[PDB]
Amino acid sequence: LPSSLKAVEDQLKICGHKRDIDVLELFLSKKELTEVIDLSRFKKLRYLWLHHNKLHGISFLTRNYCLTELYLNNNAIFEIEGLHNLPSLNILLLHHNELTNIDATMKELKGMQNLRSLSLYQNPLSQYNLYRLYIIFHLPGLELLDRKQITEKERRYMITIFDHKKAHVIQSVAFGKRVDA
């Protein structure tokens, strides 16, 4: 990694700009990287391209909550833990990755309300069953689900599924006066 890190180090010379306080974007796609050295020395990075690699986990974002958009697709990433301590993410690319501990992810995702977009095609959820409505029930605050915006049909059937008490509320508070029709 440090052998190729020179190009990132050269970025100040590439743009001819000032100093390390200028960190905003970082791109390392198509370099089969697996793990990154601890990025807690850098500065207010908000855009990150680390897709098209062989990344697995995160041991480098210890205080890199300053990120706002993260692009980690087409990898072998299995790690979403402690990321809740970095809740400033708004858009995330994650397609072709390995996330299966979905309830713990949601527990992490409960602190990641800031996310506006997320991509999940070819992720295990895209290949699962009872997937999209489960996510919507867990995440009403995420709009671009697989970047595909939610529709009212999915919301309706999700409401019918997940809260049976609320479903009978829907049937009863309107009228639900007699049973057989």
Partner: peptide
Amino acid sequence: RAQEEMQHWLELDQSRERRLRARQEANRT
């Protein structure tokens, strides 16, 4: 949708291209 989705994927590819373009612009700056 199918067509839409695909077209949406193409739009995503185009946006990636534009992001690369912006990266190039920043490098130039």
